[PDB]
Write an enzyme that holds these catalytic residues in place. Structure first.
Site, short mmCIF file in Angstrom:
data_model
loop_
_atom_site.label_atom_id
_atom_site.label_comp_id
_atom_site.label_asym_id
_atom_site.label_seq_id
_atom_site.Cartn_x
_atom_site.Cartn_y
_atom_site.Cartn_z
N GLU A 69 0.83 -1.59 0.20
CA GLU A 69 0.22 -0.19 0.01
C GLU A 69 0.75 1.35 0.05
O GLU A 69 1.79 1.55 0.79
CB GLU A 69 -0.63 0.35 1.34
CG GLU A 69 -0.53 -0.87 2.69
CD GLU A 69 -0.23 1.05 3.50
OE1 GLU A 69 0.88 1.66 3.25
OE2 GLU A 69 -0.76 0.42 5.01
N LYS A 70 0.46 2.50 -0.71
CA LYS A 70 0.28 3.51 -0.70
C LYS A 70 0.06 3.61 0.37
O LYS A 70 -0.66 4.31 1.20
CB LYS A 70 0.34 4.17 -1.45
CG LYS A 70 0.42 6.23 -1.54
CD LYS A 70 0.43 6.68 -2.47
CE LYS A 70 0.75 8.42 -2.58
NZ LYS A 70 0.02 8.84 -3.76
N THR A 71 1.42 4.16 1.67
CA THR A 71 1.49 4.83 3.02
C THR A 71 1.03 6.21 2.43
O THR A 71 2.15 6.82 1.81
CB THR A 71 3.24 4.47 3.84
OG1 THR A 71 3.91 4.40 2.90
CG2 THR A 71 2.48 3.16 4.58
#
Lengths: 276, 387, 276, 387
Positions: free
Chosen positions: B59-61
């Site tokens: 995931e894009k943090t």
């Protein structure tokens, strides 16, 4: 009604779309407006006649109080006028700078664009003091030619002091008088006594009339030390003029005062930069 | 999360842009950001990229992207900690024990030291699920340099295990086996929980529930090289088709009590505030469209349901002039709004809008990918036999 | 000898053969210059991300030192930056001034010349602070509409303190931060708690996008006493922008500072002139 | 001397400037000097103008040329005593009762008055010879308005004439009958002591023995009409051939203890100041002639006699660049000097010098007029009978 009405809250985020105020006028800075007010008030109270001998001068020492050897230190961080009657600034900038400073001014004075704008003069004189029985008379004697060049009673009216903590140097601004001598016959007279104070001023000067300013790179050897000092004199014609016609064209006085101070600065700042 | 350390003056910084330059062997960290940037995922990217290579998915943090710089100083000799944020600025954190382990003594580390290694992390705020107390944290997803060696041109794979063995091992264990010769430990650090592509299923299920802050899916390519400054064709950022959106001023066109027409426009040139000067003299817009013109051109129409009517009905403020934000909802193609941006003057410059128009068709749903599952999983084995 | 030598006494008729300076530049004021440096270096230390909820507010009060009740008082007499870390400035203008001031502004913000340059705005709010177990949250409830208008963790960076002697009012400049809770509705879930503060503000507002300045004539009733305080805000996009393009267009950051500081003045001065 | 009144406001100057425009049927009092301004005398003139008319002479008084203006304000009613200097600027003196005497009674003056009266004057100072007492005084030589009547377009004889009876007689009577009614009078009034052309002999022999100051002769034609603004081809001003003179920058061409060449140069353009900058990098001018050229070209050699060389010998100061001021003695053709000017930077602009070379020839010694005494009288006796 309201669903119809034009969204008039087009203002609470209207700030995101350069008048130099919500007036479009440029209010005189705090310090500037004084020097003006001050300088002014001062001129007034010198009688009209005497008015022609207005030396308005500006020097650089370290402001030094009654209560310390160390340089003064209020709790302020930007140039302000320092009211303390006890305070005393003796002009004396450093050689290593003095040396470097003159060069800059001179190089800067023969720039392609500042051709007919600066007039440089060397002079090497002897200033001598002379007394009655008390009055103090300065007298110019040249060294190369030995010839009385300026004969006055330098009096003193008021002074200002400009603590410049952000700079290595503070500024005494002195509005003072050159009263030429009473007697019809005195430049001879006092060449009577071996002068009770004598000094040697190898002075290099730098006129600029475009602002009405003239700049002095003075090496004086008094008779054990030898002090180097820096001065910005303001062409008394113009100064007397912009006063003479205040009421009428008011902003003449303002514009020439700040130029005076702007000039005070560029030097004071540079004089601080050169350090190291 | 408020920055781990602080930058010094700009000068003190400068020295280091340079210090990085050769460790990458390019001036690039003078002003250009040395961390690789991710370019919006396209449909055209499946059969070209996602079919003829290998992928990784986390995931894009939504944390503060900052890469890690660790250098001993032949200024006067110490490992300094450094933080390299979105513009090329350089922060400096307290005590870290980063080494190697050339021999054996579980002890060996306490004297050893890391010099001129460049690793890539992201800085999060972290919610501990059992207990709820928050800590600051650092989760790292790539590395491009190890102890003076330039690990850019390396295949992602290696660059990662190289960040595993050489940078994590020391740190972690030094903290298992000496939990006191380090109190100087400003935050914590872990490695980004990776996963191969064909596990979008196993990825996507997390995203909503993870203990951090996160918008999207990220694709990083196994046998592809890294980057210093600027973006790269091969690094892939996925966004909710939703997420994409813009601020539509809506001006109302209507010739008196139930829903009328709500048209949505795009400001161009400089005529909005121009108009605002001649907008207070209003009765109603009817005659203003003559001067309103040099800024607003409606390419849109919202949609207001009968429930969605009964919510704009009791509360109000003057409308013919407002600002709205909304995404073209995919299971309609129709674009319902979710928020009004009073918080802004107007809309957006048309160009700046057309660029967003661009991305919405190129938005490829989660369900548009949870279909590719078994298909990369079919080709990707085939590679292992066909090479 | 002498005869052969060139007539150097070319100095007595030398004034006979109005520039900002002996350079034609304008040296930025000592205050201005520094505020500039401050405003800069500060934003810098604030991370690039938050850097958009930035507030460079300007307030009227009486810089008071810790060693005593009275207004402070170093020995100086033109405005300057007051360096003392026990000094604190509590804004609280005189109610009577405050009345006179708003009309000067509502007036000046409606004359025949200044048409669509001035936009005036009433908000009467009800600010609540809140705890947990330390974070504190300002929440602005309306009084006619009763609805949340600003949800924030007002957090502070540095202040500047400007002791203005020649004037009956000093100035704080606080470049602090306006941090929200992200878009999820805590303002609905904030009942697992009642507020630990409650103010009431009859604030009235003049923005002026032509300088980049808003004037907050603000009555605050607390819940004893109410306080009549006066502030000036700078249009943060404009700010962040001149900041962004520093290095390139310096001039822009500069004239945007001074015009900020020039507004302080008009008010700081007007305010003083309306005593009596 | 110090001016007997002051100027009043700028508007209140404009107002009178208007009244004056009409009173002589030309609005020039807007700016230009109302009174007549003389042209410089020539030998050329003798046959031209002094031969073909009937002319006047008095000495040129060296006071502060200041007209008299007397009018009775249609603002608030009362008589006004006004003064017009070289630049058109208006002064306000105190108590004066300027009248008439149209009837007879030796009181008459006391309620009678003067309206529209313009008389051109010279404000000298005045020594009493029998006592030594100095006094402020105003003298009158022509008048161009009496009692609203524009006395411009009329011959001198009749211009002077009226002014006698009209203005002066009632001043004088009024002061002679009643000494007390008027101490309000700040200063005395008298007629300019007129004499005709054919009396120069009688004139000059007085020229040097007058209590006030006189820097030449002035010449006026009887039969001729006066003038509004600026110059007039028949009004003449005599000065010494010696009076006109100029500042010469003295520079020294030389190859040692007895006199050398002293060449006199004239500054052109703006290179003199620019010289001084590198002038202090001197030993002596030998080389400096190089740049200096830019501002200096010489024409004349001076003249230092043998009791005149000794005089500058003992006392001295640096010279190759001082300034000297000298009339060309017409008896020798060369030019002896009579003072230097320290108080002046350079010499004078080539052009602004040329204009004076002109006059020194145009003069015309005292005898060089005296010789013609019998020849305007013979030529007058002719007009007396020819007409």
């Amino acid at each position: 009604p309201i669903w119809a009405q034009k969204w008039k809250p087009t203002i609470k985020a209207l700030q995101s779309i350069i008048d130099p105020s919500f007036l479009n006028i440029i209010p005189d800075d705090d310090l500037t407006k004084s020097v003006q007010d001050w300088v002014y008030a001062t001129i007034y109270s010198i009688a009209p006649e005497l008015r022609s001998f207005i030396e308005l001068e500006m020097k650089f020492g370290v402001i030094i109080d009654a209560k310390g050897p160390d340089r003064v230190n209020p709790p302020v961080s930007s140039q302000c006028v320092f009211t303390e009657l006890d305070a005393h600034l003796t002009p004396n900038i450093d050689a290593s700078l003095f040396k470097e400073l003159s060069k800059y001014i001179r190089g800067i004075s023969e720039v392609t664009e500042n051709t007919g704008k600066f007039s440089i003069i060397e002079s090497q004189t002897r200033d001598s003091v002379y007394r009655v029985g008390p009055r103090f008379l300065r007298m110019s004697t040249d060294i190369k030619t030995g010839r009385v060049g300026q004969f006055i009673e330098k009096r003193h009216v008021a002074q200002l002091l400009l603590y410049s903590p952000k700079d290595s140097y503070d500024v005494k601004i002195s509005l003072n008088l050159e009263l030429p001598v009473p007697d019809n016959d005195p430049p001879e007279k006092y060449k009577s006594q071996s002068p009770i104070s004598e000094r040697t001023k190898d002075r290099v000067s730098y006129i600029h009339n475009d602002s009405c300013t003239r700049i002095d790179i003075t090496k004086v050897e008094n008779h054990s030390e030898t002090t180097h000092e820096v001065e910005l004199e303001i062409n008394t014609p113009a100064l007397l003029n912009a006063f003479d016609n205040i009421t009428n064209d008011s902003k003449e006085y303002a514009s020439l005062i700040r130029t005076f101070l702007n000039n005070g600065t560029i030097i004071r700042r540079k004089l601080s930069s050169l350090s190291y | 999360p408020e920055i781990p350390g602080l930058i010094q003056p700009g000068n003190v910084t400068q020295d280091l842009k340079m210090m990085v330059c050769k460790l990458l062997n390019s001036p690039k960290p003078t002003k250009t950001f040395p961390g690789s940037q991710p370019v919006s995922f396209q449909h055209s990217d499946v059969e070209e990229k996602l079919l003829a290579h290998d992928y990784y998915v986390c995931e894009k943090t939504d944390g503060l992207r900052v890469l890690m710089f660790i250098v001993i100083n032949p200024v006067t000799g110490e490992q300094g900690c450094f933080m390299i944020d979105r513009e090329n600025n350089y922060y400096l954190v307290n005590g870290f024990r980063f080494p190697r382990l050339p021999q054996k003594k579980k002890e060996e580390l306490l004297e050893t030291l890391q010099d001129g290694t460049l690793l890539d992390g992201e800085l999060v705020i972290q919610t501990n699920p059992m207990t709820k107390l928050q800590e600051l944290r650092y989760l790292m997803f790539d590395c491009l340099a190890i102890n003076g060696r330039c690990l850019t041109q390396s295949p992602t794979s290696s660059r990662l295990a190289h960040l595993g063995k050489e940078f994590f091992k020391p740190y972690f264990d030094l903290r298992a086996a000496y939990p006191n010769r380090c109190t100087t430990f400003p935050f914590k650090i872990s490695m980004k929980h990776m996963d191969f592509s064909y596990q979008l299923v196993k990825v996507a299920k997390s995203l909503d529930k993870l203990p951090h802050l996160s918008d999207g899916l990220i694709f990083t390519p196994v046998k592809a090289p890294y980057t210093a400054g600027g973006k790269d064709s091969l690094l892939l950022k996925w966004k909710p088709e939703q997420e994409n959106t813009v601020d539509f001023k809506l001006i109302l066109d209507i010739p008196y009590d139930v829903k009328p027409v709500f048209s949505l426009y795009v400001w161009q040139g400089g005529a909005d505030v121009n108009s605002r000067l001649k907008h207070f003299d209003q009765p109603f817009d009817r005659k203003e469209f003559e001067i309103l013109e040099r800024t607003y051109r409606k390419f849109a129409e919202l949609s207001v349901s009968d429930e969605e009517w009964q919510n704009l009905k009791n509360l109000e403020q003057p409308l013919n002039g407002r600002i709205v934000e909304c995404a073209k909802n995919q299971e309609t193609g129709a674009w319902e709004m979710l928020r009004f941006r009073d918080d802004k003057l107007n809309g957006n410059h048309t160009s700046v809008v057309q660029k967003v128009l661009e991305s919405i068709n190129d938005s490829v749903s989660l369900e548009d990918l949870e279909e590719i599952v078994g298909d990369i999983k079919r080709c990707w084995d085939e590679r292992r036999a066909n090479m």
